[PDB]
Symmetry: D2
């Protein structure tokens, strides 16, 4: 799979488990088209979102439903969600990992692109 | 000044200067309506986006145009921009600072919320 | 004020107030010599640690006592403290802001370095 | 292994490869005793540092030689190294992952403690 998402919890020092993730692809009319989605596993990871065939070049948005995650833990959060927007490029290494570290009023995201 | 944006550059250890910022507010029809925009100063700070009267309850999106920043410095970054989406003022007026720390393949964002 | 420390709380979305900070400087015998200390104010900022005359070339360690901060708030955190170690002023005097963003099991730190 | 270290590079969007990592344990006389060390793999990870038998409760310091990493890439860095100092506690989950995300003038570190 060319696209993986990993989510960590900075308050509990744990993977962020059962977090909803939605992936969108920018369509020609400039709107966001549903592309793939799922929920992070017990390791905070979401595998199997797409295939090499389907993951063509383009602009993609990964939406991490952080607000629901914190609410389920009884913790009051700031953001509605975390959004990661990037261009997939065939020249570059082949595999994309979108990692996010979550706190109630902050998040960090990085991209690990490898061959 | 109930909304301020601050942007730092993690590669240079400096304020991120001349970063374009667009603010949107979700409308009744659930689309993103333009609300305010500006560019960060020499200190990396963007003041004067809105007023207490204008900055009503709602869901706001702060778009930080990180790609245009890195590309103006001769660098090809990963993200198109950084998007910070939050409900504001739903327990009354607050002051929000949206801070962001930028690297070519990563960014952090945090919010400081104070009661005037 | 060539050295300033700023600390934010990522759980509350607020400045991290009353955070103890200890600064050390590596001595000729390669031990850490106490250099300055203080506590962050209501803004999360610690000013007045040192002077331009006193803040000479060297390797400095800024210890931020994150554990005592979280424990004073009734929380059991992971780290003992956050340590920021850097060479300073080796191309002449600079102004350093050491910023840190704190969560119970995580912290970020960045440096803003400017030329007076 | 109860202790793993992972290092990522925020400038290149890649694992931080061949980074030296030194682990120390605080001794009774308040000095730092060498405990384990190694270099991150091609995945940015350092496995096999210690064993359950040796990793007793105590205060540990993980030192990541970030300055040498950046110099080898021709990039001018700020920090001498990144230090992560924490108490190992037997009540807690058993496995500790110390993760660090590196930029030239900034770094983030988080702890993932799982069972
Ligand atoms: O630095 C500021 O004044 C506010 O923004 C920030 N604050 C901290 Cl503590 C970090 Cl690590 C990064 C940023 Cl961008
Ligand atoms: O830890 C991973 O496996 C990848 O994701 C991450 N990696 C690092 Cl280094 C930090 Cl500090 C945070 C995250 Cl979310
Ligand atoms: Na309300
Ligand atoms: Na010199």
């Amino acid at each position: 799979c060319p696209l993986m998402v990993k989510v960590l919890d900075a308050v509990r020092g744990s993977p962020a488990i059962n977090v909803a993730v939605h992936v969108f692809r920018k369509a020609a009319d400039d709107t966001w088209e549903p592309f793939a989605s799922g929920k992070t596993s017990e390791s905070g990871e979401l595998h199997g979102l797409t295939t090499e065939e389907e993951f063509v070049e383009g602009i993609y948005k990964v939406e991490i439903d952080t607000k629901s995650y914190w609410k389920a833990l009884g913790i009051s959060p700031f953001h509605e969600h975390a959004e990661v927007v990037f261009t997939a490029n065939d020249s570059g290494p082949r595999r994309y990992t979108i990692a996010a570290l979550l706190s109630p009023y902050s998040y960090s995201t990085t991209a690990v692109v490898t061959n």
